[PDB]
């Protein structure tokens, strides 16, 4: 049933110091293989 009266963005009240980088770490499995420039760095 429709309810426009409540705030439904309450999850972030419980985010922590490492929340963002923990998500980035879980996402690392779904990424595609990164492209390569052919060298380890511009200084190689």
């Amino acid at each position: 049933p429709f309810d426009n009266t409540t705030y439904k963005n309450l999850q972030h009240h419980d985010y922590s110091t490492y929340t963002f980088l923990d998500l980035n770490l879980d996402l690392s499995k779904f990424r595609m293989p990164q492209p390569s420039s052919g060298r380890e760095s511009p200084r190689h």
Binding site: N4, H13, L21, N24, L25, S28, P35, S36, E40, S41
Partner: protein, 213 residues
Amino acid sequence: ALFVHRDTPENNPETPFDFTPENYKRIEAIVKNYPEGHKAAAVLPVLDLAQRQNGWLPISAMNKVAEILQVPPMRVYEVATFYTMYNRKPVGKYHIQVCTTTPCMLRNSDSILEAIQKKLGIKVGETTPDKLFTLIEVECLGACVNAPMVQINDNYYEDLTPKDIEEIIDELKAGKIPKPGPRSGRFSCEPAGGLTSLTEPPKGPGFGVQAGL
């Protein structure tokens, strides 16, 4: 507010710093977000990670990130000094950041700033003797319609009055974690006094789609 470094007993290249075993896995995911051969793109997220582990960036912390990413230390020093969210001196457990730019200034952020000083006894830029709080002014934090506002660590506390901010400091002094968001009668960025838009139920999948997909 000095952009040169002089070694001191608590801030020198031999000052002990290293990432935790858990934070080395986080670094690996950060590095993989960028193309091979451009690992230097990870300088900002990795310095920020070291700040989250340590609370601030000693010269040894900058030297460690430079080594791990095989970047010249100077290029790490440039990033640390350029970006204002990097703390090159220790700050209190709670880093209070009051916005004083014009939209917030028009809603009397001076009163909010004055209240924090009166309650904590410190001035702008100072840390309390117990090292619990640090106070600074900052530029617009992108919460202009919810002014006056402050950011304490990663949380925005919005629509503040002198009483509201004083309570927040009290809750923090007791170890509690106050709820972020507006302290007025609203939830986020909506008009106070009832919505002037978005009062119908949203249309579901397929509404108004042109023919031919």
